[PDB]
Amino acid sequence: GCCSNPVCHLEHSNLCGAGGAAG
């Protein structure tokens, strides 16, 4: 989803982490 995107992943760093919502 959004987490798979570097920009979103950076912002949602604590939200997605390194496993949660792998897309």
UniProtKB/Swiss-Prot annotation:
Q: What does this protein do?
A: Alpha-conotoxins bind to the nicotinic acetylcholine receptors (nAChR) and inhibit them. This toxin blocks neuronal mammalian nAChRs (alpha-6/alpha-3-beta-2-beta-3 (0.39 nM) > alpha-3-beta-2/CHRNA3-CHRNB2 > alpha-3-beta-4/CHRNA3-CHRNB4 = alpha-4-beta-2/CHRNA4-CHRNB2). Also exhibits inhibition of D.melanogaster alpha-7/CHRNA7 nAChRs. In addition, inhibits alpha-6/alpha-3-beta-4 (CHRNA6/CHRNA3-CHRNB4) nAChR with a higher potency on human (IC(50)=1.49 nM) than on rat receptors (IC(50)=31.5 nM).
Q: Additional info?
A: There are currently a number of patents describing the use of this peptide in therapeutic applications.
Q: Which domain of life is it from?
A: Eukaryota
Give the protein name, as stated in the record.
Alpha-conotoxin MII
**Result when mutating residue 13 to A:** 2.3-fold decrease in ability to inhibit alpha-3-beta-2 nAChR
Q: What is the effect of changing residue 10 to A?
A: 1.5-fold decrease in ability to inhibit alpha-3-beta-2 nAChR
Indicate where this protein resides in the cell. Secreted
Domain notes, please? Answer: The cysteine framework is I (CC-C-C). Alpha4/7 pattern.
Q: What is the effect of changing residue 14 to A?
A: No change in ability to inhibit alpha-3-beta-2 nAChR
At what positions is Cysteine amide found?
Answer: 16
Cysteine disulfide links: 2-8, 3-16
Q: What is the effect of changing residue 12 to A?
A: About 2700-fold decrease in ability to inhibit alpha-3-beta-2 nAChR
Family membership, please give it.
Answer: Belongs to the conotoxin A superfamily.
Location of region: Ser-Xaa-Pro motif, crucial for potent interaction with nAChR: 4-6
Q: What is the effect of changing residue 15 to A?
A: 2.4-fold and 15-fold decrease in ability to inhibit alpha-6/alpha-3-beta-2-beta-3 and alpha-3-beta-2, respectively
Q: In which tissues is it expressed?
A: Expressed by the venom duct.
